[PDB]
Amino acid sequence: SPRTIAVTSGKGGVGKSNVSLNFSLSLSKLGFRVLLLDMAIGMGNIDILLGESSSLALADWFSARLPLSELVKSGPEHLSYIAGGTGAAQWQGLDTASIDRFLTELQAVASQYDYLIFDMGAGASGERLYFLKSVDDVFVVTTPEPTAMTDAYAMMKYMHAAGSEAPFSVIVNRAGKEREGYEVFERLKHVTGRFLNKDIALLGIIPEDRTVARAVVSQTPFVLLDPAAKASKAVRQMAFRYAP
Amino acid sequence: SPRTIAVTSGKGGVGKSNVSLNFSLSLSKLGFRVLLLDMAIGMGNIDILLGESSSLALADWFSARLPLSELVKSGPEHLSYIAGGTGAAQWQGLDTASIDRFLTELQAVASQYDYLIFDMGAGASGERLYFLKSVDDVFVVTTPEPTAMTDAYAMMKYMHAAGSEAPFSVIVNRAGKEREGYEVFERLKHVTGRFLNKDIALLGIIPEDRTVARAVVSQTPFVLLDPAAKASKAVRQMAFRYAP
Ligand SMILES: Nc1ncnc2c1ncn2[C@@H]1O[C@H](COP(=O)(O)OP(=O)(O)O)[C@@H](O)[C@H]1O
Numbered sequence: 001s002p003r004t005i006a007v008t009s010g011k012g013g014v015g016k017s018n019v020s021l022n023f024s025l026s027l028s029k030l031g032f033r034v035l036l037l038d039m040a041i042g043m044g045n046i047d048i049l050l051g052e053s054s055s056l057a058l059a060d061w062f063s064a065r066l067p068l069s070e071l072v073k074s075g076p077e078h079l080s081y082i083a084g085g086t087g088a089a090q091w092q093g094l095d096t097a098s099i100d101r102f103l104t105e106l107q108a109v110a111s112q113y114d115y116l117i118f119d120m121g122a123g124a125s126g127e128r129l130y131f132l133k134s135v136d137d138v139f140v141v142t143t144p145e146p147t148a149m150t151d152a153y154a155m156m157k158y159m160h161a162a163g164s165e166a167p168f169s170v171i172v173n174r175a176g177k178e179r180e181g182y183e184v185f186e187r188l189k190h191v192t193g194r195f196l197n198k199d200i201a202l203l204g205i206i207p208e209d210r211t212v213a214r215a216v217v218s219q220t221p222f223v224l225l226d227p228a229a230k231a232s233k234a235v236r237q238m239a240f241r242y243a244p
Numbered sequence: 245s246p247r248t249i250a251v252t253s254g255k256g257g258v259g260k261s262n263v264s265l266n267f268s269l270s271l272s273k274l275g276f277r278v279l280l281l282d283m284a285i286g287m288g289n290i291d292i293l294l295g296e297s298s299s300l301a302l303a304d305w306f307s308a309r310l311p312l313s314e315l316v317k318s319g320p321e322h323l324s325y326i327a328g329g330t331g332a333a334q335w336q337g338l339d340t341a342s343i344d345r346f347l348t349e350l351q352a353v354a355s356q357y358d359y360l361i362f363d364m365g366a367g368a369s370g371e372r373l374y375f376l377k378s379v380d381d382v383f384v385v386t387t388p389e390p391t392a393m394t395d396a397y398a399m400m401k402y403m404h405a406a407g408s409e410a411p412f413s414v415i416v417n418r419a420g421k422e423r424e425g426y427e428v429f430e431r432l433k434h435v436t437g438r439f440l441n442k443d444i445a446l447l448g449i450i451p452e453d454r455t456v457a458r459a460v461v462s463q464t465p466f467v468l469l470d471p472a473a474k475a476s477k478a479v480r481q482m483a484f485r486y487a488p
């Protein structure tokens with residue numbers, strides 16, 4: 001059966017979507033079959049980062065009983081994905097019931113992949129914390145800024161309070177120096193272990209790199225736009241270390 | 245009798261909290277009575293940016309039969325504010341009835357201010373949209389990035405579809421050149437004006453500035469840390485133009 005990963009964060013602006021897509025693409029390149037799901041319904045960024053014209057999206061599954069398998073889009077390197085959507089006139093969100101049915105139709109087309117990767121909406125919500133208790137791995141993205149780190153810790157506290165028992169792995173992104181990344185992680189590891197009795201791990205450290213910004217403007221993922229960039233190697237390396 | 249302003253964004257990481265805080269400080273410095281409310285309950289960032297330690301916050305208000313009046317904290321330059329809080333063993337979310345409670349109790353002190361400024365959670369929610377219709381002005385913050393701009397559009401579309409009659413004013417933050425701010429605004433004004441038949445205004449353009457990031461690490465608001473910085477003058481002049 002496929003391994004499920006949810007990528008999350010304390011707050012937006014930590015590069016969580018960029019990490020999700022570029023980590024998924026690295027997994028694809030190693031030869032795995034990956035389905036990436038943009039769980040930001042009506043506010044999805046996965047399509048934009050690939051520079052793909054908006055077409056059918058998850059929000060459409062909410063709105064026409066269309067089966068999930070027809071939402072599945074092909075991306076570079078054999079990556080499959082499902083977009084969050086541009087939405088209709090009015091706002092639409094997920095509740096626990098609709099989350100439930102979604103998970104059901106998902107396993108119907110899940111068995112094909114080695115990995116199912118969920119790009120979660122940033123931060124916490126009742127419905128998001130509900131979704132997160134089922135996954136095998138929870139990735140938590142943070143940067144070295146105090147706001148991002150404080151919010152990452154809160155997020156881990158809430159997922160834990162809401163009975164998530166999944167292993168938490170930290171991705172320290174936008175690190176200035178490699179030591180700085182380890183020290184961000186030590187701080188988070190200290191507070192989670194002492195206050196929550198929760199032992200977390202470091203998935204990897206991604207440096208601050210202009211290539212990322214360049215990749216976003218040009219709408220071409222950085223691991224593909226420049227595989228030799230520092231961030232690109234850091235993410236390829238993270239994926240390699242994660243995979244068996 | 246105060247004027248109410250909700251500062252919103254399509255996605256996090258656009259500088260919204262920094263803009264909310266530094267714009268409020270500029271208004272207070274012009275001599276107005278300002279109350280800033282951090283609506284990111286359980287994930288408050290305003291305390292952090294100010295370098296002030298915890299104290300009571302919305303997270304203590306939520307569960308614990310306590311009047312908003314007692315959450316008011318004194319910030320620099322005579323700014324008053326209410327912190328979102330660090331939580332809370334468990335996640336807690338504003339629902340329709342808690343918003344009513346909030347807005348009701350808010351009327352007990354609203355009278356003592358010229359401006360109430362709500363630093364809203366980023367993105368949309370059924371709850372946020374219910375909150376955003378008792379406000380006079382909606383500021384929408386974006387950067388020149390395509391993800392940020394697309395999300396800002398969708399947020400404006402959602403607020404408009406939910407019956408919001410308030411004028412939308414855009415803040416383009418992290419502009420590389422002042423001209424890029426106009427390029428960003430022109431695109432947004434275009435798609436909103438042609439598709440939604442909604443006339444939006446430019447509140448101002450804030451340049452990319454290392455000073456901002458320095459202010460976050462130093463936990464001292466950038467307009468106070470260095471009043472001469474480019475971003476600091478931009479925000480000060482934005483507030484001057486907005487105030488009577
Ligand atoms: N490693 C990095 N180096 C430089 N900029 C980065 C890096 N990671 C992320 N960013 C910047 O952060 C912005 C927001 O990234 P995004 O993936 O949208 O984050 P989130 O999903 O956390 O909001 C990007 O558009 C880019 O400017």
Ligand SMILES: Nc1ncnc2c1ncn2[C@@H]1O[C@H](COP(=O)(O)OP(=O)(O)O)[C@@H](O)[C@H]1O
Pocket residue numbers: 011012013145147253255256257258259260261262263289366417418450451452453454456457460475
């Ligand atoms: N004008 C700017 N110049 C440089 N960096 C900025 C600017 N505005 C925001 N930032 C950066 O963006 C980060 C996130 O800002 P924040 O106010 O927390 O955004 P949001 O509330 O939209 O998530 C800041 O800590 C800082 O690194």
